[PDB]
Amino acid sequence: MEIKETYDFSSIVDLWNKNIGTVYPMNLELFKQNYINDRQRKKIMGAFNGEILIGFVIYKQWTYKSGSLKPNHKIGYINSIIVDINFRHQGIGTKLLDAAEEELINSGVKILRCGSDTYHFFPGIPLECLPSEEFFLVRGYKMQDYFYDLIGDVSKVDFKKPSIKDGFKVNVMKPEDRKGLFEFLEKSFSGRWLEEFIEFFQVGMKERDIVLIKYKTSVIGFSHIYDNKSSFIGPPIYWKALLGHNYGGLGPIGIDKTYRKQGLGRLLLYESLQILKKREVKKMVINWTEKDIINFYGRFNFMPWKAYRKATKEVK
Amino acid sequence: MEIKETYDFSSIVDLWNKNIGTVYPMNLELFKQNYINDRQRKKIMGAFNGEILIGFVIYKQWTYKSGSLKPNHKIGYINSIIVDINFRHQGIGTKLLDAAEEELINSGVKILRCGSDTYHFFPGIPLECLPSEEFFLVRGYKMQDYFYDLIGDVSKVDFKKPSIKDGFKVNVMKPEDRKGLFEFLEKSFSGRWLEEFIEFFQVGMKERDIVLIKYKTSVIGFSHIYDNKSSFIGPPIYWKALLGHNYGGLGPIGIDKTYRKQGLGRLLLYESLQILKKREVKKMVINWTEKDIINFYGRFNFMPWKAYRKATKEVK
Ligand SMILES: CC(=O)SCCNC(=O)CCNC(=O)[C@H](O)C(C)(C)COP(=O)(O)OP(=O)(O)OC[C@H]1O[C@@H](n2cnc3c(N)ncnc32)[C@H](O)[C@@H]1OP(=O)(O)O
Ligand SMILES: CC(=O)SCCNC(=O)CCNC(=O)[C@H](O)C(C)(C)COP(=O)(O)OP(=O)(O)OC[C@H]1O[C@@H](n2cnc3c(N)ncnc32)[C@H](O)[C@@H]1OP(=O)(O)O
Ligand SMILES: CC(=O)N[C@@H]1[C@@H](O)[C@H](O)[C@@H](CO)O[C@H]1O
Ligand SMILES: CC(=O)N[C@@H]1[C@@H](O)[C@H](O)[C@@H](CO)O[C@H]1O
Ligand SMILES: C[N+](C)(C)C
Ligand SMILES: [Cl-]
């Protein structure tokens, strides 16, 4: 058994799908997309039986700016770790994680997160990977709160228009909106979501996938939507093989803090869903939500679908 | 808005699917099988807008024997409750549950359970209905531990036979095993599982659905397996619309108490899966497991798929 760096994506993807493909169906396009485009200091360590890949760990350190935030080198990420089912309980997982953790720690990492990285596969430890919690617990990870992906079939329900509101308009983004959007993000969501917008446009996100809410002239909120014609396979549609032919998704979605708790998020959501529904979307996901916002999406018939536990190791 | 008893199973099935069908796809066949064959005192109370069903609750009292056990009339069950998405937060669920609970309480129920009834749809509050936990909390239900359905694609993996002490042999049940099977259940599982066996054989279960493990001529264990030829749609295959073609399932599985913790359950599980694999089964479910037993199945590449929270109200 040898531990060494690998960039054999096909072998990794095949191993992924054999072990967890029932609930996290991976394809090479997504896998390449997310690994190649990530801008953080990153590495894949494989475990090998001769030339046969029998495990891997993908890990990162926050070394690349997030919008207006400079990188915090103290934060590292385990993007994913899987040892093949036929080679479990032989110490392979331990060695892979030790290899990742040692390297991150030697480069100044003091806080180690299970998922939640840029270009993540997971926001935390998936519930379908619940048995892994004990493996991480024993290795110093503290198990925290949950995040959720929500699912709904927008073809199945009609919603009545939200209360009409003077001044506000919701519309898919046009090219001309680009400057107003970027100024809005700089003001209101100037970290990760600003960074995503910067980078997603560079790898073929299109304006048709952004919805904007304006008061008069000013962008006060946005949503990012996905359907089966979107070319960027973003987080809401990672697991689109589970979502049927007319799959879609939504996230992120945000309203300027000033404007919140007055029904404008609701208006944005409603019209964003109406847009997807007119694009003939059926089953669709709203990814990476907190418990106390579930009911906001629940109003529109969304239900928790996948749950992920937040898990963090502090290097003492 | 009227609260009254409802008979139209098709309207119930549609409301079910409209509201939660993405994650718990119902059909009339499944609905009828489970509601009609249930032997407890049972009722469906509907909430109506004129002629239109807008919500329902299905509820039961333990009034029918369970193998050699008398019913405990102190136990009641909320089988399911759904209010249509366009009629939430109008007090309808409250009204429906108030009626169900009042009727149960009046016929002697002191402990009200979420799910877990005979012919259940759910062992507890599904994670996909996490928001309803709060609804049940306010009514005095205590949120307790979790159960899990596990999923695996038995076509994707091969395992080495577990080592086999001489004398033990596993085989698919034959008609002449019936008496030996019933003697064994009477000895080791004389409550719920004996009762399921009694009833299921009356409503379409075939011997080909049962695997037996013997020590010599003695039955010492069984599993109930399911594929797309099973005429009884049991708990593992309720949500078969999510499992694809060549779906299957397994559960229950039991070994005589005097024979446990010697590797025999592992052997029975292994052969049961081999039989399903040879039947061309792909994705399959092992239903209603506790957290402590997940790794037993985990070694055969099963993963938690659905989670349900146990919830119990003590009548004051
Ligand atoms: C951010 C995320 O990736 S979340 C998702 C995590 N990944 C998954 O859930 C995918 C599915 N699961 C897996 O791939 C694996 O179970 C992993 C990666 C979690 C664990 O990998 P493994 O190779 O089994 O780990 P390893 O074998 O080192 O350790 C497991 C146990 O076996 C023990 N062990 C080590 N050598 C042996 C041996 N020769 N014989 C028996 N047991 C052994 C270890 O001590 C350990 O027990 P401990 O945790 O109580 O210390
Ligand atoms: C065993 C099982 O069945 S588990 C699965 C449970 N079912 C589901 O999850 C299906 C999806 N969800 C639903 O169907 C619904 O949300 C239900 C059944 C959980 C609740 O139905 P509702 O009709 O919205 O309940 P109802 O309106 O009485 O009460 C809900 C909330 O609205 C408010 N409310 C209560 N009464 C009223 C009223 N007269 N008018 C307006 N609002 C009210 C309260 O804020 C209440 O919150 P609380 O329950 O936390 O106190
Ligand atoms: C509902 C929502 O907005 N979820 C977003 C998600 O879409 C995005 O992928 C992630 C990372 O930026 O941040 C979450 O907050
Ligand atoms: C793994 C297992 O045995 N699960 C069984 C399940 O199959 C069965 O449906 C239920 C009710 O009888 O009892 C559970 O213990
Ligand atoms: C690097 N990150 C903070 C955006 C996850
Ligand atoms: Cl009835």
Side-chain angles (χ1 to χ4, degrees), chain A residues 1-159 162 165-315, chain B residues 1-315:
Chain A
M1 205 283 285
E2 120 156 290
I3 302 301
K4 58 171 162 148
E5 179 152 4
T6 177
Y7 300 90
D8 183 5
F9 303 163
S10 276
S11 284
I12 295 165
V13 164
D14 289 354
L15 189 152
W16 180 296
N17 276 327
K18 179 180 172 213
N19 288 267
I20 70 166
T22 54
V23 291
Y24 294 96
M26 178 56 60
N27 59 80
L28 192 53
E29 169 182 355
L30 167 64
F31 189 92
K32 294 180 159 141
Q33 173 199 258
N34 276 17
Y35 191 83
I36 294 174
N37 292 318
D38 185 277
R39 297 192 189 165
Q40 312 298 347
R41 185 179 162 260
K42 59 194 180 184
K43 196 140 145 179
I44 307 175
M45 284 288 302
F48 286 90
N49 187 218
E51 298 193 58
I52 296 167
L53 185 76
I54 57 165
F56 73 89
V57 59
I58 311 187
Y59 56 102
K60 295 180 191 169
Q61 178 178 22
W62 189 8
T63 60
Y64 190 78
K65 58 152 202 133
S66 173
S68 76
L69 297 171
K70 66 242 184 215
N72 186 354
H73 282 65
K74 289 162 148 43
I75 316 294
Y77 303 87
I78 305 299
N79 158 282
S80 56
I81 175 165
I82 315 176
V83 168
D84 180 77
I85 187 62
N86 296 115
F87 293 89
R88 295 281 173 82
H89 292 257
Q90 301 174 15
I92 303 164
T94 295
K95 292 172 160 152
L96 285 168
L97 189 65
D98 284 344
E101 278 182 13
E102 184 168 58
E103 183 170 347
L104 290 168
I105 285 160
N106 295 341
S107 314
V109 170
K110 304 302 184 190
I111 288 153
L112 290 154
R113 308 200 181 289
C114 285
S116 84
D117 46 313
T118 51
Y119 289 100
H120 65 285
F121 296 120
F122 310 126
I125 296 164
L127 173 150
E128 303 96 324
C129 297
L130 170 65
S132 79
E133 288 188 10
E134 209 59 46
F135 167 94
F136 293 110
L137 275 163
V138 164
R139 285 149 184 87
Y141 291 72
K142 306 312 178 234
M143 299 299 124
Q144 301 151 116
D145 45 285
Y146 301 86
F147 291 122
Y148 304 91
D149 297 340
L150 316 172
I151 194 161
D153 182 334
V154 295
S155 74
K156 285 183 163 159
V157 178
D158 298 311
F159 297 106
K165 322 188 77 114
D166 281 307
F168 296 92
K169 286 159 66 70
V170 190
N171 295 94
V172 181
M173 186 186 182
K174 299 162 303 193
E176 50 274 31
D177 289 309
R178 213 123 149 174
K179 272 128 192 188
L181 169 59
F182 275 97
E183 297 169 31
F184 165 78
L185 290 160
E186 281 181 301
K187 197 91 208 309
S188 308
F189 295 104
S190 60
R192 178 170 198 150
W193 293 355
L194 168 60
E195 187 60 36
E196 290 183 3
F197 276 90
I198 295 167
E199 306 184 10
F200 294 4
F201 275 129
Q202 310 182 248
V203 292
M205 172 180 63
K206 333 279 178 202
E207 279 85 356
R208 75 182 285 274
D209 284 337
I210 306 303
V211 183
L212 304 174
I213 181 170
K214 281 170 180 182
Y215 179 70
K216 296 155 177 179
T217 240
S218 299
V219 178
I220 67 157
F222 77 100
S223 74
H224 181 165
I225 57 175
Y226 293 84
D227 67 12
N228 73 12
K229 295 171 202 221
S230 300
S231 65
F232 191 64
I233 305 178
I237 60 164
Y238 285 168
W239 319 121
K240 67 176 149 70
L242 304 179
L243 297 178
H245 186 275
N246 279 31
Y247 63 89
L250 182 154
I253 178 168
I255 289 292
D256 177 357
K257 205 205 312 289
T258 297
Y259 298 84
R260 294 185 198 155
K261 302 286 222 299
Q262 307 180 40
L264 302 164
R266 184 161 147 200
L267 178 59
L268 173 58
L269 176 55
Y270 169 84
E271 297 290 353
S272 297
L273 300 172
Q274 287 303 288
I275 290 164
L276 286 161
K277 188 176 193 177
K278 290 170 189 147
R279 295 176 179 181
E280 302 185 78
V281 165
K282 293 171 173 155
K283 295 181 162 226
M284 56 170 283
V285 166
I286 297 178
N287 74 303
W288 196 340
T289 68
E290 294 158 28
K291 183 174 183 148
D292 292 341
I293 202 68
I294 289 164
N295 296 344
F296 170 71
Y297 305 102
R299 299 195 79 268
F300 296 90
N301 215 31
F302 286 82
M303 290 174 90
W305 182 47
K306 292 179 171 298
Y308 307 94
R309 198 164 208 172
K310 180 169 174 46
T312 306
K313 173 180 169 158
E314 295 202 21
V315 170
Chain B
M1 184 288 287
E2 305 297 322
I3 297 295
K4 65 205 159 163
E5 186 161 2
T6 182
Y7 301 92
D8 186 334
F9 296 164
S10 286
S11 301
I12 290 159
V13 166
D14 284 350
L15 191 158
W16 179 304
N17 283 328
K18 183 179 154 186
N19 287 275
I20 70 177
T22 55
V23 292
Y24 292 104
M26 182 58 60
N27 56 90
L28 185 64
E29 175 177 17
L30 175 58
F31 190 88
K32 287 170 71 168
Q33 182 201 268
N34 276 22
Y35 188 79
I36 294 176
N37 297 296
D38 186 279
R39 288 192 197 186
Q40 312 298 342
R41 165 150 45 167
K42 59 190 175 186
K43 187 153 162 158
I44 308 166
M45 189 72 12
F48 296 80
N49 185 201
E51 295 191 15
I52 312 309
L53 190 71
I54 58 174
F56 71 87
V57 56
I58 302 178
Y59 59 101
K60 315 181 173 163
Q61 182 177 21
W62 190 6
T63 57
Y64 192 76
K65 53 150 211 114
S66 180
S68 68
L69 307 167
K70 67 174 274 173
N72 181 0
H73 282 88
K74 292 187 308 207
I75 315 298
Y77 306 93
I78 307 306
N79 159 278
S80 54
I81 180 170
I82 311 182
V83 173
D84 182 71
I85 184 61
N86 292 304
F87 299 90
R88 304 277 173 87
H89 294 271
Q90 297 183 23
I92 301 169
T94 291
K95 264 298 255 200
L96 287 165
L97 206 38
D98 282 355
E101 288 181 8
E102 181 193 47
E103 181 177 340
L104 290 169
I105 290 169
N106 287 345
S107 54
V109 161
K110 306 264 207 244
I111 292 159
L112 293 153
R113 295 200 192 289
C114 291
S116 84
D117 45 311
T118 50
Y119 300 93
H120 63 285
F121 297 122
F122 312 117
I125 301 175
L127 174 149
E128 304 99 320
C129 301
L130 167 66
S132 81
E133 289 191 18
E134 170 63 24
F135 171 79
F136 284 114
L137 269 190
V138 168
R139 293 190 67 85
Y141 292 76
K142 294 181 190 327
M143 299 302 128
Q144 301 165 116
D145 45 275
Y146 295 87
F147 295 115
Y148 303 87
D149 299 340
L150 317 183
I151 196 172
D153 183 341
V154 87
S155 74
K156 290 327 177 158
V157 293
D158 286 330
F159 301 97
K160 248 171 209 182
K161 194 155 38 197
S163 64
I164 315 173
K165 201 190 317 184
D166 299 318
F168 297 101
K169 198 186 209 295
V170 171
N171 281 77
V172 174
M173 171 181 182
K174 287 171 284 195
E176 65 265 37
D177 291 323
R178 205 171 286 212
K179 203 207 290 185
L181 170 55
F182 285 98
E183 287 164 20
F184 152 84
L185 298 152
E186 271 143 39
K187 189 214 193 218
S188 318
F189 300 113
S190 69
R192 191 170 191 149
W193 289 351
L194 172 55
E195 189 62 34
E196 285 182 11
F197 269 102
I198 287 166
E199 296 181 17
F200 287 4
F201 272 132
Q202 303 176 42
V203 294
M205 179 169 86
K206 311 298 191 318
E207 284 84 352
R208 73 175 293 274
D209 304 330
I210 306 298
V211 179
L212 302 181
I213 175 161
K214 288 170 184 190
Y215 180 71
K216 301 187 177 196
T217 60
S218 292
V219 181
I220 65 133
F222 78 95
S223 64
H224 186 171
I225 59 166
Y226 289 95
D227 62 17
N228 71 10
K229 297 181 209 213
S230 297
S231 46
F232 184 72
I233 306 164
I237 60 155
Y238 287 166
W239 320 121
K240 63 190 164 42
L242 309 174
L243 300 177
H245 295 301
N246 302 279
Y247 61 79
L250 181 155
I253 181 162
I255 294 281
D256 175 310
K257 187 173 152 155
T258 67
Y259 286 99
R260 297 182 191 159
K261 314 313 214 325
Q262 312 175 17
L264 301 166
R266 184 152 167 92
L267 176 61
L268 168 66
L269 179 57
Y270 168 86
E271 298 290 349
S272 298
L273 297 175
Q274 287 291 288
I275 292 155
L276 285 165
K277 177 179 187 86
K278 292 176 173 130
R279 290 176 185 184
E280 302 195 298
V281 169
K282 298 180 168 162
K283 296 189 188 203
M284 52 157 299
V285 175
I286 301 176
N287 76 299
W288 197 341
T289 69
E290 289 136 30
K291 186 176 168 175
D292 270 28
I293 201 73
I294 286 162
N295 294 353
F296 175 67
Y297 306 103
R299 291 219 169 251
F300 292 90
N301 208 40
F302 283 80
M303 294 177 85
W305 180 46
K306 282 185 187 299
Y308 313 89
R309 198 168 201 182
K310 181 166 151 85
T312 307
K313 171 175 183 167
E314 294 189 339
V315 175

